[PDB]
């Protein structure tokens with residue numbers, strides 16, 4: 001996250017850190033808890049991943065340095081990538097992880113609701129992007145989970161900033177005209193969470209953009225509400 005600030009324990013309890021364990025253990029992507037055995041994340045995170053065997057999902061983490069050799073994690077039973085996925089910029093950047101066991105909910109780990117059925121006309125004015133990703137180009141994964149508040153932009157305006165890409169209604173964009181705050185590499189797969197009537201909803205999945213926090217280059221997110229039928233079918 002560029003231009004963000006440190007989160008605190010329990011602030012974003014649906015946020016997980018997905019690690020790969022080969023050839024080294026590192027944070028690969030973010031994700032969101034949406035059910036007791038289900039993480040919603042981005043398909044592009046799994047580039048070059050040979051099988052779910054090398055993945056670990058850690059929940060209830062604030063600092064990456066908290067993760068030691070005895071820290072509990074969930075194994076991944078299955079990775080479900082959208083069948084239309086090709087590359088992040090072309091859409092369908094969505095995947096589910098089915099965990100090997102259930103998540104017990106606590107103040108540090110709980111699910112986030114999807115955008116509600118019937119809420120098409122809701123205008124989201126309080127959206128936040130969170131993650132352990134880069135804070136600038138050529139950075140490293142950050143220790144403390146970062147947060148930044150970002151305004152949504154219209155798909156019409158987003159298309160004007162990305163004339164070389166097809167910005168579809170299965171995507172949503174968020175950014176400032178002068179940049180400064182944005183998601184970046186390593187934040188991918190995590191949530192764009194918006195609070196409405198004091199309830200947080202998972203509105204976007206961090207997906208792609210041109211650089212990070214550049215002027216007039218908003219971040220592009222998978223528009224979760226357009227995938228509710230797909231999510232419900234895979235998790236039912």
Ligand SMILES: COc1cccc(C(=O)O)c1OCCc1cc(-c2ccc3c(c2)[C@H](N)CO3)cc(C(C)C)c1
Pocket residue numbers: 028029044045046047134136137138182183184185186187188206207208209210211212213218219220
């Ligand atoms: C094989 O590559 C990867 C494999 C698995 C995971 C990832 C990942 O995305 O973490 C990955 O990197 C994809 C390439 C990339 C993405 C992004 C970026 C990611 C999210 C994002 C943006 C930009 C927009 N500002 C809004 O939200 C940035 C870079 C450079 C410029 C630092 C590079």
